[PDB]
């Protein structure tokens, strides 16, 4: 398992947590020196448990699919909660079976569906370490509308930060004051599958993307990523979604 404590958290302890989370995800191969996540894992091993503690020391445990870093569900005291999607229902066959009761959330886990439930796009939701403390607190007691916004925070400050060092750094700059994510952050989130795929296609194609990926850069301008020499690939992306799952 991996763990993170908000009580006393700072850029350094958060960086250690994100390091721990990346490290918990199995791979047999690196592509362009990036860990390539597995095509599949069978059974309960496919799920990582993340124990998160709010400032008061209250906790939830979040179940993450190790093949794609997707949040499937979470446990808060004796109640488990899972997204309304088949991969989550499958996960509920393996994790938090000890819970007194299980709630299926009234949305799936994808951004569009969560934003609808939440009533705002994530462009308008501040993220940061304080926002994460709030999200854990919220998820402690069932409220599906508030839970959708908390889950948008939780997904970006955990999974998206594991995927991209730029996102991890953005959260680090937000250790003590929340801020809506940069449009570059939004762009990388939305491009993860495409980038992972193109980085994979680049082997067998001289480091060259078969199809270019358009990102917004951390200076606000729109740009094209065409090969493995881009800073996005050499320094930023930390994990590859395997093309079998794409
Ligand atoms: C159309 C849709 O909802 N896609 C994915 C789901 O499926 C992926 C791509 C798959 O092919 O396994 C995934 O389970 C959820 C995670 O909660 O996020 C969505 O972005
Ligand atoms: C490779 O990517 C670099 C970085 O943007 C770019 O300057 C160069 O034009 C690209 N080369 C090819 C062949 O795509």
DSSP codes joined into one string, the chain: -EEEE-TT--HHHHHHHHHHHHHTS--SEEETTEEE--S---GGGGEEEEEEE-TTS-EEEEEEETTTTEEEEEEETTEEEE-SSHHHHHHTTTS-TTSSEEEE-SS-SSHHHHHHHHTS-GGGS-BSHHHHHHHHHHHTS--HHHHHHHHHHHHIIIIIHHHBHHHHHHHHHTSSS-BPPPHHHHHHHHHHHHHHHHHHHTTTTTTEEEEEEEEE-TTS-EEEEEETTSHIIIIIB--B--GGG-
The two tokens of residue 103 are: 């709630």
| Å from CA of 151 to ligand 2 middle | 37
- The angle that helices 165-173 and 183-201 make with each other, rounded to 10 degrees, is 160
By the 8 A CB rule, do 13 and 176 touch?
no
Choosing from 29, 160, 173, 179, the catalytic residue is 160
Counting ligands in written order, the one closest to the CA of 159 is 1
Q: What are phi and psi of 30, to 5 degrees?
A: -110, 140
Residue nearest atom 6 in ligand 1 by C-alpha distance: 110
Q: Is 123 a catalytic residue?
A: no
- From the list 245, 204, 196, the residue with the least C-alpha distance to 225 is 196
Closest residue (by CA) to atom 4 of ligand 1? 110
Q: Rounded CA gap, 169 and 77, in Å?
A: 31
Pocket of ligand 2 (CB under 6 A): 208, 226-227, 229-230
Contacts of 134 (CB under 8 A, 6+ apart): 150, 153
Calculate how far, in angstroms, residue 139's C-alpha sits from the geometric centre of ligand 2. 44
**163-246 homologous superfamily:** Ricin (A Subunit), domain 2 (4.10.470.10)
Residue closest via CA to ligand 1's atom 19 equals 110
What's the CA gap between 145 and 136, in Å, rounded?
14
Beta strands 34-36 and 47-53, pairing class:
unpaired
Token pair of 64 as six digits: 């993450």
Find out if CATH 3.40.50.2300 is the number for domain 1-162. no
Greatest extent of the chain over all pairs of C-alpha atoms, in Å:
54
Task: Give the Cβ contact number of residue 115 at 10 Å.
Answer: 19
- C-alpha dist (Å) from residue 21 to 44, 52, 121, 163: 17, 12, 26, 10
Q: Residue ranges of the domains in the chain?
A: 1-162, 163-246
Whether the CB-CB separation of 197 and 219 falls below 8 Å is answered with no
């Amino acid at each position: 398992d991996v763990s993170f404590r908000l009580s006393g958290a700072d850029p350094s302890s958060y960086g250690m947590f994100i390091k721990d989370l990346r490290n918990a995800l199995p791979h047999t191969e690196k592509v362009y020196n990036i860990p390539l996540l597995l095509p599949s894992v069978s059974g309960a091993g496919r799920y990582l448990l993340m124990h998160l503690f709010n400032y008061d020391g209250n906790t939830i445990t979040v179940a993450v699919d190790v093949t794609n870093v997707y949040i499937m569900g979470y446990l808060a005291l004796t109640t488990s909660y899972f997204f309304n999607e088949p991969a989550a229902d499958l996960a509920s066959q393996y994790v938090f079976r000890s819970a007194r009761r299980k709630i299926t959330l009234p949305y799936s886990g994808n951004y569009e569906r969560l934003q609808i439930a939440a009533g705002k796009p994530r462009e308008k939701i501040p993220i940061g370490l304080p926002a994460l403390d709030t999200a854990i607190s919220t998820l402690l007691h069932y409220d599906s509308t508030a839970a959708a916004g908390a889950l948008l925070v939780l997904i970006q400050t955990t999974a998206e930060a594991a995927r991209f060092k730029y996102i991890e750094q953005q959260i680090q700059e937000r250790a003590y004051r929340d801020e809506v994510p940069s449009s570059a952050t939004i762009s990388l989130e939305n491009s993860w599958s495409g980038l992972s795929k193109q980085i994979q296609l680049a082997q067998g194609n001289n480091g060259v993307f078969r199809t270019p990926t358009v990102l917004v850069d951390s200076k606000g301008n729109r740009v094209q990523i065409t090969n493995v020499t881009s800073n996005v690939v050499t320094s930023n992306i930390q994990l590859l979604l395997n093309t079998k799952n794409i």
